[PDB]
């Protein structure tokens, strides 16, 4: 299912990154479900968080496919 980016990041310990999404009008996981690492870099997400967030996004993709 879709979910808020607030909820999604909280599960990954990446809540400090919320504003990078919200300032761009990004509020749901479906909006960012196909974001790559390059895309997260474009949002200016600090490097310490990027791989963790991206791996979370990939997991959501996979759960979505096999749901």
């Amino acid at each position: 299912t879709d979910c808020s980016i607030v909820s999604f990041l909280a599960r990954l310990g990446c809540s400090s990154c919320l504003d990078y999404f919200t300032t761009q009008g990004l509020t749901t996981i479906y909006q960012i479900e196909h974001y790559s690492m390059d895309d997260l870099a474009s949002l200016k997400i600090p490097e310490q968080f990027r791989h963790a967030i991206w791996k979370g996004i990939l997991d959501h993709r996979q759960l979505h496919e096999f749901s």
Side-chain angles (χ1 to χ4, degrees), residues 18-27 43:
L18 182 62
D19 291 356
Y20 298 97
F21 293 94
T22 57
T23 56
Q24 304 297 302
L26 304 163
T27 62
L43 293 181

Side-chain angles (χ1 to χ4, degrees), residues 24-65:
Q24 304 297 302
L26 304 163
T27 62
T28 73
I29 221 304
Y30 274 9
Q31 288 173 310
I32 61 168
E33 211 174 23
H34 291 293
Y35 273 36
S36 66
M37 294 269 252
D38 281 344
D39 296 328
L40 299 173
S42 90
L43 293 181
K44 305 307 184 191
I45 296 285
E47 271 267 57
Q48 65 263 32
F49 295 105
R50 287 184 205 162
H51 192 269
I53 292 176
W54 177 77
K55 189 59 179 171
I57 291 171
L58 183 54
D59 283 338
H60 204 274
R61 277 182 217 163
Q62 297 173 352
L63 286 162
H64 200 163
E65 181 191 356

